[PDB]
Amino acid sequence: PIVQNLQGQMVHQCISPRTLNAWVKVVEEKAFSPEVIPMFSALSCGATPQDLNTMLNTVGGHQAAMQMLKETINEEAAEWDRLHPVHAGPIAPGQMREPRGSDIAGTTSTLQEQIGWMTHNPPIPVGEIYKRWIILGLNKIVRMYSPTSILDIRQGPKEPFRDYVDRFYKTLRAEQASQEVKNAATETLLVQNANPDCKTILKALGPGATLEEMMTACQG
Amino acid sequence: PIVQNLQGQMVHQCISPRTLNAWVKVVEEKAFSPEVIPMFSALSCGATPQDLNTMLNTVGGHQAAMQMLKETINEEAAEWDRLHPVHAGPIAPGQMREPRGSDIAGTTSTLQEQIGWMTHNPPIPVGEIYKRWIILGLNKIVRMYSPTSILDIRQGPKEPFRDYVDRFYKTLRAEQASQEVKNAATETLLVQNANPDCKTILKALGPGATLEEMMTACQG
Amino acid sequence: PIVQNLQGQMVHQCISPRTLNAWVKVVEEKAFSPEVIPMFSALSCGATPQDLNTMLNTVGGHQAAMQMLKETINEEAAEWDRLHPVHAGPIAPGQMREPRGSDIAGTTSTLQEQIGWMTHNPPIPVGEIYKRWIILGLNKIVRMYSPTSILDIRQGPKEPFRDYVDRFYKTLRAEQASQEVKNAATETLLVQNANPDCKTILKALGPGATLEEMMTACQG
Amino acid sequence: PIVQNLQGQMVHQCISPRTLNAWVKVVEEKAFSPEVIPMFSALSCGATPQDLNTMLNTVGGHQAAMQMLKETINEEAAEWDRLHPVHAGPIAPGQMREPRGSDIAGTTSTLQEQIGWMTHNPPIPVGEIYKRWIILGLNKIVRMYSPTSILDIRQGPKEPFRDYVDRFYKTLRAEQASQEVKNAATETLLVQNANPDCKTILKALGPGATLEEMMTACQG
Amino acid sequence: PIVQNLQGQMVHQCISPRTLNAWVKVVEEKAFSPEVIPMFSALSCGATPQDLNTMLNTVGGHQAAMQMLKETINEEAAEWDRLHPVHAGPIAPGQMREPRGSDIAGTTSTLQEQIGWMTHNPPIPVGEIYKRWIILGLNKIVRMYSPTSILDIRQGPKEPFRDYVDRFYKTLRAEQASQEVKNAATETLLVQNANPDCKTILKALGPGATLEEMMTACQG
Amino acid sequence: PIVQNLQGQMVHQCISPRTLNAWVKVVEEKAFSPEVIPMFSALSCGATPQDLNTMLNTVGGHQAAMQMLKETINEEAAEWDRLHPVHAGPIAPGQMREPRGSDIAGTTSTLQEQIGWMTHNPPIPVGEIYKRWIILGLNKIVRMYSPTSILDIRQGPKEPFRDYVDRFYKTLRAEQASQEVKNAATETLLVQNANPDCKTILKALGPGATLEEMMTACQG
Lengths: 220, 220, 220, 220, 220, 220
Ligand SMILES: CC(C)(C#Cc1ccc(-c2ccc(Cl)c3c(NS(C)(=O)=O)nn(CC(F)(F)F)c23)c([C@H](Cc2ccccc2)NC(=O)Cn2nc(C(F)(F)F)c3c2C(F)(F)[C@@H]2C[C@H]32)n1)S(C)(=O)=O
Ligand SMILES: CC(C)(C#Cc1ccc(-c2ccc(Cl)c3c(NS(C)(=O)=O)nn(CC(F)(F)F)c23)c([C@H](Cc2ccccc2)NC(=O)Cn2nc(C(F)(F)F)c3c2C(F)(F)[C@@H]2C[C@H]32)n1)S(C)(=O)=O
Ligand SMILES: CC(C)(C#Cc1ccc(-c2ccc(Cl)c3c(NS(C)(=O)=O)nn(CC(F)(F)F)c23)c([C@H](Cc2ccccc2)NC(=O)Cn2nc(C(F)(F)F)c3c2C(F)(F)[C@@H]2C[C@H]32)n1)S(C)(=O)=O
Ligand SMILES: CC(C)(C#Cc1ccc(-c2ccc(Cl)c3c(NS(C)(=O)=O)nn(CC(F)(F)F)c23)c([C@H](Cc2ccccc2)NC(=O)Cn2nc(C(F)(F)F)c3c2C(F)(F)[C@@H]2C[C@H]32)n1)S(C)(=O)=O
Ligand SMILES: CC(C)(C#Cc1ccc(-c2ccc(Cl)c3c(NS(C)(=O)=O)nn(CC(F)(F)F)c23)c([C@H](Cc2ccccc2)NC(=O)Cn2nc(C(F)(F)F)c3c2C(F)(F)[C@@H]2C[C@H]32)n1)S(C)(=O)=O
Ligand SMILES: CC(C)(C#Cc1ccc(-c2ccc(Cl)c3c(NS(C)(=O)=O)nn(CC(F)(F)F)c23)c([C@H](Cc2ccccc2)NC(=O)Cn2nc(C(F)(F)F)c3c2C(F)(F)[C@@H]2C[C@H]32)n1)S(C)(=O)=O
What we know:
Chains A, B, C, D, E, F: It is found in: Virion. The structure is a homohexamer. Chain A is mainly α. The first copy, chain A, folds into two domains: about 1-145, Human Immunodeficiency Virus Type 1 Capsid Protein (Orthogonal Bundle); about 150-215, Orthogonal Bundle (Non-ribosomal Peptide Synthetase Peptidyl Carrier Protein, Chain A), CATH 1.10.1200.30. Chain A is about 55% helix and about 5% strand. Chain A has helices spanning about 15-30, 35-45, 50-60, 65-85, 100-105, 110-120, 125-145, 160-175, 180-190, 195-205, 210-215, and strands at about 1-5, 10. The first copy, chain A, has a two-stranded antiparallel sheet. In chain A, a hairpin with a 5-residue loop joins β1 and β2. The longest helix of chain A has 21 residues, at about 65-85. Chains in contact: A-B, A-D, B-C, C-E, D-F, E-F. The interface between A and D is medium-sized, with 30 and 36 residues. The complex binds ligand A1BUL (6 copies). One ligand A1BUL sits at the interface of chains D and F. One ligand A1BUL sits at the interface of chains C and B.
């Protein structure tokens, strides 16, 4: 990764074993649950495209998910070349050449070239760009590997309200969509799909009632 | 997080993997017990709004509580905006515009802005403001998810006074309350809820006795 | 905590997760045995009053012990104000204001104010003062939570001497008293409460006999 | 390893114990699965030939594979020697003689030579050259020790398409192949090996479909 | 501990949590086996008397041994005082008064005094002197708590010579002895205590044979 | 150990607890298998003779092996004195006195004297010399504690070839000898001691066939 030495110059450090293991275990333990996106984003903090590939390649199993990931990377990398045409001149001693979509993915870029792009007077972040594509690809995985649909989430007759909401938003979260789509679902289904006993209590508070006001009401 | 390098200048570092694991395991292991708020406040020492969202996003499950936490944060951001006006003047010298309540949340704010706000020569603590909002929501969650009521706590004749006293003060910690209220419950309820054999000993000690004195007297 | 950077200026660092976890586990694993006082004193090395509160607040359970702790802190904090009257003047650019008992406990002091008191040309240690009170409060807990009394410790007929002494001093240690009280007990009870077989052997060595001389004699 | 101190000069450090344990446990736990090559490449970041031999020697068992790894390394060293001639000229100024293929292996090379080669102002990467040779042998070992054949992989009617797709791409990863070959197998074999009910859905999607599209369509 | 910062000046640091856990677990796991003395000597590297007392106080249980350790330390302190006279002269310039035996123990000495003694331009090693006293007591404890006697160790005909040889040398390590005494026991007892079938082989090898030679000869 | 501070001066650091524990566990877990030599060499990286003794003394059990080790050290230390006669003059302010065999073993050398020899303008490495003897002594242990002889290694009738080779070289490795002795064994016994079915296949490839070519042929 590109960390900052005490000299204020962003230097390339080796990806710590602690970081690798943590990434391998979250994938083995938590699989592709929503909390795998934050862990990756945090464990990839300041990573070079090669550091990212390293992490992804350490993922044992889920090779299907990994292929979709490569497909999404290929997709987004094609959006980088269709929006950033290659800019061919000579080579200067001030500036780096124009990065390409494949260069960002680390396929056609070396570590030095990657490192330089991130450590540049006008910095072009190939790491954060690459990481941006990956997290999008993992959102398609979490969406896919989510068996539930928010519509299929209904409160059971003997189910505590806190549990139904935990399930409502667990499904809502995995089903990645606009915050507007996810906000409309709550105001539509959270009370509509509640069991009749608590549902009349919820209707008995008014739509402008917080989730806290809903959940404290249907306690027992 | 915004840590202080040996140069005395507050520099930004990556959230350590250890810190992530600690925050995740204290939520998995302890759930929303009162001792998770201190753990959060400690594990988020000098964290940026992006670091705080990272920790909150790593919390697998409890999505009901997490949405409640978001609602508390939204309320606090609205209050911040009403407390702090938007400013008309255009782009001033070595200065940071005032963060909006959403900027403190990091929903509308870049990490560089966050780092700049925290590292500004007259610092503005966008991360700590957000952390206060988060902690308020955590306190709401703990109180909601605490079944015990201080009035409900009572000492069985078979039960030790010290075991009952643990539960009584655990219930008082679990249920957010003003320190005076907690003292008032401690003054009146603890003896009255205690079993009569222990209670008569407590009455023998009189009002001016340490909890140690009360405990040693009922111990036998 | 207030650690020393390589610049020789005592700087405030964040309490490491390793330190927190270690404190949580010793309390969960070892509870309030005597070895919890050293672990706290060591894990609190260089801690600010807020760092201490953090640790104490992370303690899950034993809330009874925690209330006695607050009581003892309240007691000692009252001894700080009865011996250090508040000293009100203007504010200078050399020196810090006079600390108060509540300020030491972190109740009525911010981290900056705490930090400054510890990092002062004439240093006033609010951390080591606060820690001094806490360890005293934990000595009352270990004393209380010790079910045994040194008088109730007697060597069994089929009990090896090394085991009886381990129990004699295990109880002796938890029963915090003057080293003079604890020295008198040994010279009184260690041999008096030994079983008759070994007891005559001990009497057969003379009072000026080391514990080693006692324990090697009653081997088998 | 050759790490970069805060002086900007690449200095030599000892291979951390954590790094050793990680490399040993990933071989004990994962054996020679494809995910051990990335783990090796990462755990050997900036390693000297002596550090690489250290890791390889710590591998308990798999001695057949290890001897195969040695043979691959020997071949690469012979190829290096034929690529790079031995040089007649005697002992030049601030310069490093060309390493022989055995010197890159570290069999005939001192650690000081290795450190000097890597730290030379025009660096020669003796450790990275050796690491490439090692990784080639590791790839040979993984392919040999992978029982699965991409043609052998087939979807049972009972088996989920996504589970079969995992196996198919795991087998393609386990068996070293050119990326075009792997794409060719993916294009033709994946649908044909899939079970007919899923296969007819895949045929309905047509050639231009994401693996996600294929998977969601056969999912049900 | 007194560690050396990058400024070449020995600075004081806090005893790391890892170091504490290691010292506690090696006592819990290994108790007072001979291998705990090296572990202590290593875990107390460059420790102050306060750090040494911290480690000793963290030892849960074994209070008989701990009191024995205190007695050994008291004896050594008395011997130090008789070796080193108290000095009449009043308060000299950049100099440290001579520590009393109790000061080395840290019973009568402040940590600042300890740090000053160790960091004095002509250093006085109050911590290392105390550590020697502690280690002497530890050796007394190990020898007392070792049941085995080198004369008692003997090889069963069923028992392997190498297993017996392990026990023989373990017993010699467990029982503190002069190196010449241990050599004398090794020279005479090891063959004589060995079983006759192995013993006649040992006699065939003759006096001038390595323990390896003896072992390989009795091995079969 | 003697590590390099950022000032470029090799300074003596304390042996980390992580290093100790790692050495204790590899001996307890892996005993004297061949992979214990690399772990020691790596865990001893940059160690002083006292640091080495510390590690060896932490080894719980295998005291027989430990005595042979002392014997081998005594042997090699005698080769240091028979090749390096003591060189007695005065004491200078440039240079260190001539080291002795016992000084290298740490028996008759202090840490300062050891440290100085390693941190000398003309460096004389007492640590790497001592470590060189130890690893030789452990090669005699691994040889001894290896019950198998390469001659007694034969492929079973229902044994996969990969397993027989793993055993052939596992034994070959533990049986430390010249690489020439170990190379001759392979070309002699690896195919000679194969079961008849695979053996004719191996003979059917020619002696100039790699181990890979052998092992891919006898797959099934
Ligand atoms: C750092 C990177 C590491 C990141 C991130 C990042 C950036 C900004 C924010 C954010 C903060 C504060 C507010 Cl007030 C809002 C807000 N207000 S609101 C009510 O929509 O109107 N929205 N957002 C989101 C956005 F900023 F994008 F608009 C908000 C956030 C927070 C993180 C957070 C987690 C737990 C508890 C509080 C907050 N929220 C989300 O992540 C989106 N989310 N969605 C859903 C659902 F249930 F609907 F599916 C859920 C969340 C969820 F909050 F996590 C929580 C369990 C429910 N994280 S990473 C890979 O970890 O993400
Ligand atoms: C660091 C930041 C991380 C913080 C903090 C922070 C700041 C100040 C204090 C504090 C210290 C000393 C005293 Cl004497 C009082 C005192 N005396 S008083 C006015 O008469 O009641 N009050 N306070 C609290 C207040 F600051 F408000 F004054 C005191 C504290 C204390 C520290 C402390 C923990 C455990 C044992 C002793 C002390 N922790 C709490 O008190 C929390 N607690 N709550 C309850 C309730 F009531 F629920 F049962 C109980 C506790 C409890 F102590 F564990 C005990 C079993 C009862 N922590 S953070 C986000 O983690 O908070
Ligand atoms: C650092 C802070 C972290 C501390 C501390 C600190 C400061 C000084 C001393 C100390 C050292 C050497 C001597 Cl010779 C004496 C001595 N000589 S004597 C025989 O009384 O005349 N007394 N002391 C104590 C004092 F200095 F206070 F006077 C001595 C000590 C030592 C620590 C030590 C532990 C184990 C083995 C040897 C020593 N001893 C105590 O802690 C008090 N103790 N009591 C009792 C009992 F059995 F009686 F209950 C026991 C101890 C005990 F030694 F632990 C041991 C199991 C028995 N620790 S902390 C929170 O960890 O404490
Ligand atoms: C760091 C060093 C440590 C390295 C490396 C390194 C360099 C570049 C890339 C890479 C990135 C993005 C794209 Cl879009 C492609 C792409 N697209 S393409 C041309 O159409 O196929 N190819 N490559 C690979 C190549 F560089 F060759 F172009 C791509 C990579 C990728 C990173 C990556 C891992 C997982 C998920 C997404 C991405 N890892 C692999 O691909 C390995 N892999 N293999 C196979 C096969 F085929 F066996 F099934 C499969 C994978 C797999 F991705 F896991 C997935 C389930 C299929 N790693 S190291 C020694 O560890 O390697
Ligand atoms: C670092 C400080 C931390 C230290 C130390 C320190 C200093 C020097 C030495 C040492 C080195 C080499 C040789 Cl050749 C001899 C040698 N040869 S001799 C004169 O003929 O006997 N003697 N010594 C010891 C002495 F220094 F006294 F000379 C030798 C040592 C050695 C190092 C060592 C450990 C294991 C295997 C080889 C070597 N450790 C011990 O010897 C302890 N030991 N004891 C016994 C007894 F007898 F009980 F069975 C046994 C051992 C044993 F080696 F494990 C072996 C199974 C027998 N450690 S510390 C507080 O941990 O000590
Ligand atoms: C650092 C210190 C820490 C060290 C070391 C060190 C120094 C140099 C070398 C080395 C490297 C490359 C080549 Cl091509 C050859 C080569 N070519 S060859 C085919 O003989 O002609 N020989 N050597 C060895 C030597 F340089 F000494 F000549 C080679 C090595 C490598 C390490 C290595 C381990 C695993 C896989 C590849 C390599 N090999 C050995 O260690 C000796 N070995 N022996 C045997 C057997 F099976 F025969 F018993 C085996 C090995 C073994 F390779 F480990 C492997 C399981 C078989 N390690 S340490 C205490 O860890 O050792």
